[PDB]
Symmetry: D2
Subunit: 395 residues, 4 copies
């Protein structure tokens, strides 16, 4: 990092995270993303929506969303038609890479005010008919599930992410029981944070037109913890000897999250109060079926970029694609669980894939405040072999 123009986070906001075909399933991904952008900008005293110059928004399963999901998010949030808008896809890391690109655009001097984040409506992912143009003369055909194909299946092995999670349990020696106790713990932390009001600030509730109106205030998944059923359920990907289950994996989910970034000159020009400063970031990648432990490369790289030692981080967000992913990255990096996902993680909160990268950053800012920490680091792995990480200082 060192001597480049500083980048400040002046706000952040997220939708509640809805369950698959659940509370938010009637909204499109641009609708969720617009809602988060609008709510992030409303929090900045002295910054107008018309000051936003550029948007990078993550989104993975973009089929049937329409032209440029980010542009639709931005216009739907009331930004000016002059706003530059780009949609980003690095699968599960899309939301964080979007924020990195936003910070880079300020650093290279091409913008002073950037909104970045991500959105996903997994409920509204369609099915594909791939061969209607040239036809298929004879034989049964397939309707491809867009979630499986473009979100959850490794391209080279043609295996779903749960089988990569099983590789992870084998590679790093985590049993069914260890994965279940981790998942119970992270559900408990998410429920405790919920009940204590600790998500109230970051969440922007959604009002659904009515019957009268419906208001969605809370993330849908945390309440679902039942530890007896969790410990008793059959494994989801390998019969008999499997370790990965639907309880101890992240679910399929709907949601969006956004941050507002400004340059140092704009912070002073508009007399803005920054929430946090971006200190650095890192992307890394390894063998695609081992994407589960790519954060163990991206996190040290972000820390080096930021000029910060790992021990000085007060809180980590390690995205819980599966419970085994958190366990393996904690083991490889030597990070105690006492510093990880202090308000729960994606296993209990949900995982709307194009949004999760920005979602955990929003939650991390809340964790640092609630726990009186200064330095935080978010790390998220992604299908294909990659991971992205970011370091922030709460001001």
């Amino acid at each position: 990092m060192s001597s480049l123009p500083a980048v400040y986070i002046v706000s952040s906001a997220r939708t509640p995270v809805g369950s698959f075909l659940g509370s938010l399933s009637s909204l499109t991904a641009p609708q969720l993303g617009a809602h988060a952008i609008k709510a992030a900008l409303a929090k900045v005293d002295g910054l107008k929506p018309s000051d936003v110059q550029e948007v990078f928004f993550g989104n993975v399963i973009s089929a049937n969303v329409g032209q440029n999901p980010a542009r639709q998010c931005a216009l739907g949030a009331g930004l000016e038609e002059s706003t530059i808008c780009t949609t980003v896809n690095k699968v599960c890391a899309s939301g964080l890479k979007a924020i990195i690109l936003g910070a880079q655009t300020i650093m290279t001097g091409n913008a002073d005010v950037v909104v970045a984040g991500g959105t996903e409506s997994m409920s509204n992912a369609p099915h594909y008919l791939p061969n209607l143009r040239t036809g298929a003369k004879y034989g049964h055909q397939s309707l491809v599930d867009g979630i499986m194909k473009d979100g959850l299946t490794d391209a080279g092995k043609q295996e779903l992410m749960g089988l990569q999670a099983e590789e992870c349990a084998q590679d790093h020696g985590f049993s069914r029981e260890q994965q279940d106790e981790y998942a119970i713990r992270t559900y408990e932390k998410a429920q405790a944070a919920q009940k204590a009001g600790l998500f109230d600030e970051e969440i922007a509730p959604i009002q659904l037109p009515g019957k009268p109106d419906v208001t969605v205030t809370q993330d849908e998944e945390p309440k679902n913890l039942n530890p007896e059923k969790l410990r008793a359920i059959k494994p989801a990907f390998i019969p008999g000897s499997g370790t990965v289950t639907a309880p101890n994996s992240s679910p399929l989910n709907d949601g969006a999250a956004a941050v507002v970034l400004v340059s140092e000159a704009k912070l002073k020009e508009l007399n803005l109060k920054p929430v946090a400063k971006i200190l650095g970031w890192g992307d890394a990648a390894q063998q695609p079926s081992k994407f589960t432990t790519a954060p163990a490369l991206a996190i040290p790289k972000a820390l080096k970029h930021a000029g910060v030692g790992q021990d000085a981080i007060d809180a980590f967000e390690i995205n819980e694609a599966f419970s085994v992913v958190a366990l393996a990255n904690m083991k490889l990096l030597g990070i105690p669980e006492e510093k990880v996902n202090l308000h729960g993680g994606a296993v209990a909160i949900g995982h709307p894939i194009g949004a999760s990268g920005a979602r955990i950053l929003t939650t991390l800012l809340g964790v640092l405040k609630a726990k009186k920490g200064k330095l935080g680091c978010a790390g998220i792995c992604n299908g294909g072999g990659g991971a992205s990480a970011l370091v922030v200082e709460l001001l």
Copy 2:
């Protein structure tokens, strides 16, 4: 200018195949892998294993699988360690990818970057949007993914062809003016083809026989010009009084293109011969249905970023989304046609929408060399109201 230098050390593109034509058997990542591998084979002293990061445009990503850009990279033989992000700014995706690639070098997060774009419009699927919840009764629709995600402005739900007519009405271009432009740009592409002026930039594609092999060497569309038929055809979007036709518009096409970018340090370190220098860039946007003349904002912005006067430019690439688009931006900017698309444009060459931003840049470098120019500017409008532009200096 006071930003670190970014050098183009090579570039390459596939031939551009017609819709369901010569390249319809190849997926978008197969096309992009081909372009990437070809561009790298040109750099004396740089290995594919030296590439650190990839940005690749792709608009209609449905059924391509996880992260199109990652599939392109691994398909081209790049290391599993490579950072890969897919970019969607509709028709400008390929150029915005290169911009993001240059910024990643400028902020020092990479020294070797491959950027470009790919599109297989032949293999864009149809979507079944409502199978998860089901539909109890009634005929149901199968959404054409090209119309939905490539060609229809999300706000108005109007095809871009209709907004091209709005352009012809707004700026006073008749059927005849657009047709005569179309014929000139076809003749320029045929002349360039016959003179071998595309031979360097095109990497021919060998299709293995299941039967004899097939080598695809040339762009499929330039030979289709029939001036008699082009002048007599019915309008394509407005009956009777319409001025936009399939012959004077861009076709639907398959192809990919890629550039290799290095830092100043890495150029000296490996003693690499640079082809060109990126001098600056600019993105702009306006009212979505006026996307046709967004380049009239992006081009001056890129020139100001580059510290270059419009008069200093030796050749322009203005992407021919429609003939009327090139006419209108030439009129608004005061650029004579003899400086524009000297080897023809997308009306005659084809328009694989995710690749065209990088395709025109590849062609631009070929025009500067063939015509002994120094300074070039590429500009490309995109659905939603946007445009991107980039300035290069041939070394």
Copy 3:
């Protein structure tokens, strides 16, 4: 003409309950429904084994994704011998009655002695079609075609739904929204009254739906009759012409699942194995006219069947005029001069349901019950079908 040919006797009949669309019976396929009705009807005949059945005619309209020869599947599923001749019949809504006619004819030409005939329909399991995947469709949104609409409810010629031609019938013969609404209410009450009186218990063969190892679910009643709500019925918007329509969904027939079967034997096999005939087929008549006028096609087929039978309209004790819509019952009663007090005495398809391939047999099965309950001898069943046709049959209770 009939006396010059062998006699044909009905020795039993059975029907499943009629399920609502995606309702109580939606887990079963049309051959499972059909096999259930065949098996129930044969178990009623004392002195006759299922292996004595020689031929099967079975109606079914929307046969897509049902598999090879639905009738064969119903016959084998019911435990019939693999030597059984099986043919599926499609005369749209009349298919179940036309299958019975062809069964009767097959005995009368001497080509069989024991015939099972009826029909089946699972409208819940009718699929959607993708019509152009073989040759392709290079560019443009395409259509997933609802098989019920295409092959069941739309006139081929005009490409218009039957409800719109039910409207045509209403303007043709002067029946208001009020007159259809109040007839609908009456046939719902007749159906509910029959239900509460137990008058369907004999003809209905309840279906046992298996459990996940756990007792079993049992569908005993028709699902539609309980849904009568006279407030909502008179207040609902019309279904086919906004604002000025008379035909509504409550006074039309529903989409439904169900099957029905009768057993037919020649005069020789009756006396041979000593069987108790329930009824005798006295004659039948098919007729057809303008496709959009199918609603009044029973007014041609019913007289033709009576003439074939050598019986008078005033001699008939009960009529089953199938209620595709309330207006077709109104219209045919007006054209023929038949008073409602002799028509659909346990209710009709508006209240019971209209599994289209089965309904022609369903009304015959109910007709035999009406005659037993109301102490009658002569019944006439008549049913219109999309395309312009109708079929009618005349029975004498023994």
Copy 4:
């Protein structure tokens, strides 16, 4: 004694290849064409004289309400005509004619048109679970031809596999089936060359609104290549399989129709009959052994007609597969010199709903050309059944 039934005429379309020369036509268009052609051949019979229609059609999905009604009306028949579609899979076309003859014999009609049609090119695919939905997972589009035409219900196996059964059951090798296929292809091409199909085939006009097109020939017979046919791989069992696409019948489009009249109507209108229906027979056995169900139905039809097997001048035994004609010839003891004299379904095509009427149509042209008097046509059908009919030419 029940009234006699006379065939006064019959016609059939050219048989088109799968997705071929007739794929632009729907099954009712093909069916209407064949009805109006057979009606044009009769002097003194007006189209308004037809009272009832029975038409076979198997894969009826997306054809619209009552294919037989559409065929009748498209052919110009009166809206008063009674129309029923019949499905006994491959026997549908012949079972309809049997039903039509019975409708005359019970006195309910004096003029019936019967036959069959199939457009396998235009059979759709099915999405079976859209009404209740499927929340997560890849889904199937079912090929209507496989599901409703070519797959036995209980075994869930394609008909090609039932034919490999018939080969192991009665002992016919890959070479014994391929030689028969070549012989039938050559028999088919000799009839075309000798004009022996031109009477029965009503050509179709596909006009340009573009150049005009007229299909007059059957598309399949010209495709014979004995070198390619001998050297292809098996289609249903690798390595050891004996059944292939060349020695099997194809997927095809086509229609055939016959005009039937009573004794009294023949006399009243002074019509000149082509043949007389003498008897018929339906039989069935184990579903996967349907290939040899004709060995039951053919005797039953000869029995019902009061003629013996050695009195038949020509047999049309439908060639669902080359092995099917070979097996049934072995069981009934029929010499091939008396079988499918102008070729069969393996060379001519097999539009399944129509073939039962198609082979009867061709039988009458065989009987006329070979100066024969007694013909028999039998046809197996998926599900385990078969239908047979005996005609005497007049």
